[PDB]
Design a protein around this ligand. Structure first.
Ligand SMILES: [Zn+2]
Ligand SMILES: [Zn+2]
Lengths: 489, 495, 472, 474
């Protein structure tokens, strides 16, 4: 059975997992974003000067509706003064967030994005397959039963799919649209109809499919809200599937996903056979290295296939974006390289994100790209990494040392210098005073009379250090290792 | 003017003429050349033993003796006399018990050429060199004046130079080879003729070309050794060009190269126009990102990429970067820019001695390339991915992290047949779990009646890392809590 | 009065007046009535109903249940049977064995039974054992044995009475609940009361007594109710605290010092007529040491440095004191003489696994003395050079404590350089290691050819297997 | 080959070395008593029944009548001695205050095991069953007597004969050097630190004595002739290499082994030398056949222990926990191995067997830095268990106090681990019995294992500080 588990025992913090069995196969972790919210709005005032109008959609500031955005449905080359009345009600969607002094950009041409489809129930003039894409898709799109007054777009996401699966998405957009206009026809004008960005409506919109057997929710107050959204989205057949979790063992722990979730935070994730993948992220790209466990050709082939599967889901769970480079283990047969490519392609087939994959090159690398799905490059409860001090780069022991070494010498050059104390972490004092002993001696012999003291301090770690200057006369007879305390002041 | 500055108060920098364009900064024997006397012959091993000086005798198998020592499949007893003198090179250093592998087939490696003055049967362009590169090299090599009884090899390094530049390299090997057999004809048998690895001998062997005007040296004791090496290498035309630096301002500071040397240790290197390159290194490869400055867009991207290609080439030399390199060039829409950026990189690396191979800008806008670190020294990549992060700059809080491990613990304890669950966590995590969350740790144990939850503080880990191990019924040991990290040492280990 | 105090607010203390003389702080050998699930002539065994069925091989069926044969001939499916667990779930026998302190009754089967043994072979022949059964005398007098043998017989009766009174699947006897063990190990005829401070436990305590088959005792189990804690009211809490001290004061004023080393436990004896003092303090020591061995649960080898005595008759009297003082200890104990050096060597078998109170400082060899860093460095510094002089040496790695590396590579940097320069080509690597402290270090020699490009600070790990100690 | 190496380039160390096994060391560093002179009788005092002797000090020595040998003879001192009479004289007591030194013509030559009184036979004997048998077997000249030292517990008769004869050879040379000169000079210097080494460390099997210092080597030969053995002058040799003597002979590390707690054995096992209040416990760990390994490590142990006792100068009571051996014949062979290997030692040694417990007891007579952080300078550190239990009772005692809100136990990491796992139950028990009192046990990687803290937090003073942030706060 496929389940959607929703762990919501922090009422600010929120987790949604899809699960075939114990395949965690997709995850999301959530809760302002306002783009693509739908309101009923009253027209505040008309401006023939800007060929536009102003809409009270509930916000403290009025939205902005240009003429090019008004549907023929609301037209009772024309002046806007001839098209709209003041105080006229209108179903309105946000194109662009409020910026600076400027109210949100609003359009009546409403668009309902699904997983694979974007229904424009309001205008039929937009539609077709995307530029980014198509032979079977042009055949599958013509087969869907679309009402006459509307148009649809098939998202890059729609490409490895079937027509049967598209009809399921298209109909979920239709049921929603009915309810949008049903909840508009039922009220006075200033209110909100659809929230793009709250986590239940988004979870159902993105994560629901026909193969989903249950939706377990561990919080009653939420489960009630979850029902309401399902009827507003126009799918009662799902209410029966929504079920309340009540056990005292936590939802995600009862189903054994909490560790799999934990794997999306790790540098190294283990593969089923015993190998692993190491996910490093640079300024330019994300590098994924692959290591095997403890026939060589069969091992490399086997570990790569597992790697291809793990990388795929890690890309979903982590929500990784941009450029990705996979260093697959070397394989001599070309047929293996194809099978490792085709593994990865099938594994990323279920990913909603726009993903593009090349081959295994002559250097044994695979390049690919993924579009990060959410605007919020953000992390619910985190802090700056201390060791890298916020940037993701840690200075090699070589260069750190070399850097302090030039820094010591610059202090020894200064006039009136008696001594210079470098208080460094232990490995650095080890590297400086052995590997670089020659250069340490070179400084002291060139700065005749200047004491270079490099003291290993097990109280520091490797980004941190100190280089202190001791002027002629203020030197003490303190022992090298008792200095870190001395300079505690 | 081009100078070779040598700071030895050992660092060697090539300076045009206040710009710094190349830098160079283990008791070595492989590829030393001796005159040797034959100690004793072994027809049983089809080999002989040679006294080249060392406390242990070298090993010269029959397959290594040149026809120069032959008359007309023979027994080695018919070939050599005991105590017969012979010019000998070390193939392989002394390992364990054996003395050193020796061959009479001498080879003199230059920058671009390896002269085998001893045997003509082994020369040509190597297989590493792709056809379109080699095409002109097969033409340039046929044009060099090589004496009859000897053969050459064009190193992968030869790849970007000209026939006029190769003729300069080949002649330096010839001048040396002469002196090698002149110093051998002039003495009894047991001595050393050529030392492969003086940093002076190496610097001249690797870094001299006809375009080098001066060789400033700031150390007298070394300058004298430098002249001797020049005469021993057989090039008196360069003695005049070796000069003593004397100024009180350090050699490298007078020429303003010290900061440029400092750049080979930086993560981000400013380009001339304002943009930069970010050199990150990972486990697998070296990622280089390119950023631009501050207004034609296409021109900026093109122009920044060109500067990048030039900076990356020299940084690859100065850093001595090895292995796999991925360059993320700024995106360019015209294909003609993408070829120009590639060709910029090819012409910029053309003077690197290292074997370099460069592909195209792919559909993703990446350039893959490889480079051999030249030095037995294993290269430390200037910077690299933070291990606490994986290079996010972000780390989970201790609370969210404990709560996460909490449920992870309980998930393990709920598994059938579980006796114990061991959480090996960083010290402040065990502190938080076993104090602030003690109640909840107790709740697990009391709900999983019989399952021991062991949360052990481990001062060997820090805060993103942890471990949650499951102990099945019957395989628990009476080990103390604080001694579990050391016992699980075996397992918890990541490939 | 001898009491058994049970603090369960689980600790069990045997207390004579106000003297603490003993202290205590799985499914093998549990007994059930079981129904035979199904028979297997193939494995010559049967299955007995836990969520999983037990396994009863033919060799384990008593002659009592057979009304060389096949297992299908002996047993009927669904036949009830008194069953004991031989081995935990990873084995059932119908030979049952009831272990006491001194005796293991095999009430089912008499083909059992088991040269300090001279009086034991006589004492065992004197016990009144029913015909159909045999017994084993554990490693742990005849009058004291008859008390133990009868408590097993009382128990066995109740076991077959609780089986004759019910349907077939249930548990009869639980081998291991600390109350069962305390009554099994720590009950005797001379125990007047068993005070318990916890009602929930006292109730469980009574049930275990009737199950153990001794209703005469229920009267002697009493509930403690005072607000002053049970152990404090009886003044044993300090004596319990003495089991954790290095030095325990003797009645007369002398003391014993209990040190423990790697090999053994050294007990020294100090005092407060010289001959009479030594003799008398030694007698007091033999008493204290005996009960300290019980309270601490000390195991293995014990050497006792008694105060020296010149008359041989005192030495025997101090031995025989110690022998009779340990007589009540459950553990297997063996005692030798006071040797010509005035030591007494003895051994004790720790009853369950465990360790001791104080042992000897790793930092010293047990002195308190520790060489100054200056002297310690200079020592290592001459040691390093000694290694670099050796023929065929490529490198020499000093792995020293952090302050020693700091002293060596700063204050003594000149000398370190002097070694490297006089030993042309030999690398001195002095690595600071925050895993060591200051008496300890290592100086390792790296022959020509076997050097690795390992980083100075990573050597400690590369050298683990070769720098570890046969001590551990 | 057994050698005596003498390092004297440094201002003096003497090491007995067998092959390259340092087995004895002396570091005599010289700041009285038993010097021998030829002396002229300055003046006689019948008043004090004594005389005055010129032994060449600026002050005359004092020779009572009771100290004059029958050889030089109730009488007056005036009747026995003639003024200006020459006499072989030994110092009894160093010069004190105004008096000159006490002198006796009863002369005694101390060796390692024997004191020869070549002058008087009336003093000697014991106070042992075999020593009384062994002393009666020695060939001692009529006119003289001998004492067996406390050392001489550990002498064979053949070994005693070697000591006695070295005293006799010396005594001959003493009177030979007296007969050959006028009267005021010094004959034998007891104390000049080379004399001790030759007196304690020389024997017939010493091939060479290498000395790295000329000034000292000259002094070393004079002392040999004065000790009366010119046959050795040829065996004393000047070391000259730039490599220090003790480093050329590879013994400097073996000298440094005497300071360690564990010493590795040749085969790979080791011995652990731990010293308590009562005794020295030596434990033995091993590195195929198990019976052969245990036997073979124990043999090496016995050998190593023997010389460690010598190098360390351990004294008193020693208990050796040999690796268990089931065969009784090995037990005897490990015993006999120890006995033979201490046979060289100069100290008084006694050895029992391997007991039923597998332990060997033995005693040795001793022949002649800064407070440890970790045990506060006593013998003992606590077990993590006992320490934890100790802190645990201490935590509860703080929680009992009136007006307590919290009790913070700042312990080392392994202690926090043991307390909060193995003892978690008891930690809960305190908190639940002290309703409302928070027990905070915080692991602190800044401390190690003897140290800790238990702090009390009164009601109202508690902060919202995180557990692990409490070390810093405090
Ligand atoms: Zn980081
Ligand atoms: Zn200590």
């Amino acid at each position: 059975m496929k389940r959607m588990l929703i762990n919501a025992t922090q009422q600010e913090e929120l987790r949604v997992a899809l699960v075939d069995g114990q395949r965690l196969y997709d995850l999301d972790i959530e809760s302002e974003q306002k783009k693509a919210n739908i309101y009923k709005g009253k027209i505040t005032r008309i401006e023939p000067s800007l060929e536009a109008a102003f809409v009270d959609y509930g916000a403290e500031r009025h939205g902005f509706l240009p003429l090019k955005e008004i549907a023929r449905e609301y037209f009772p080359r024309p002046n806007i003064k001839d098209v709209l009345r003041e105080g006229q009600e209108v179903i309105v969607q946000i194109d662009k967030e409020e910026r600076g002094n400027k109210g949100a950009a609003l359009t009546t041409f409403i668009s309902l994005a699904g997983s694979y489809l974007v229904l424009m129930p309001n205008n039929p003039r937009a539609g077709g397959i995307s530029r980014r894409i198509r032979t079977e898709l042009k055949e599958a799109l013509a087969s869907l039963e679309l009402p006459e007054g509307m148009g649809l777009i098939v998202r890059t996401a729609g490409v490895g799919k079937s027509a049967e699966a598209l009809q399921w998405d298209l109909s979920f957009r239709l049921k929603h649209w009915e309810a949008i206009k049903k909840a508009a026809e039922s009220r006075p004008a200033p209110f909100l109809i659809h929230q793009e960005s709250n986590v239940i409506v988004r979870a159902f919109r993105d994560y629901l499919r026909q193969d989903i057997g249950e939706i377990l929710i561990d919080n009653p107050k939420v489960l009630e809200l979850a029902r309401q959204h399902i009827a507003a989205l126009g799918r009662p057949d799902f209410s029966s599937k929504i079920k309340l979790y009540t056990g005292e063992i936590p939802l995600f722990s009862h189903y054994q996903i909490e560790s799999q979730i934990e794997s999306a935070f790790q540098r190294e994730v283990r593969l089923p056979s015993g190998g692993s993948i190491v996910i490093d992220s640079t300024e330019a790209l994300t590098a994924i290295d692959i290591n095997s466990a403890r026939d060589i050709e069969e091992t490399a082939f086997n570990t790569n296939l597992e790697a291809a599967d793990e990388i795929a889901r890690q890309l979903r769970l982590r929500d990784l974006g941009g450029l990705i480079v996979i260093d697959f283990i070397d394989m001599t047969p070309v047929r293996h390289q194809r099978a490792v490519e085709n593994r990865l392609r099938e594994a990323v087939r279920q990913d909603r994100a726009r993903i593009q994959i090349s081959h295994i090159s002559r250097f044994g690398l695979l390049e690919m790209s993924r579009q990060r799905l959410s605007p919020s490059l953000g992390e619910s409860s985190h802090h700056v990494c201390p060791r890298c001090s916020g940037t993701g780069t840690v200075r090699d022991n070589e260069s750190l040392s070399l850097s302090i070494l030039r820094l010591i010498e610059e202090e020894a050059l200064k006039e009136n210098t008696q001594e210079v104390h470098a208080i460094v972490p232990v490995p650095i004092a080890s590297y400086l005073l052995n590997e670089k002993r020659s250069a340490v001696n070179a400084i002291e012999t060139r700065q005749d009379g200047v004491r270079c003291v490099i003291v290993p301090n097990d109280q520091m770690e490797t980004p941190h250090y100190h280089v202190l200057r001791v002027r002629k006369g203020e030197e003490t007879p303190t022992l090298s290792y008792m200095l870190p305390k001395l300079h505690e002041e």
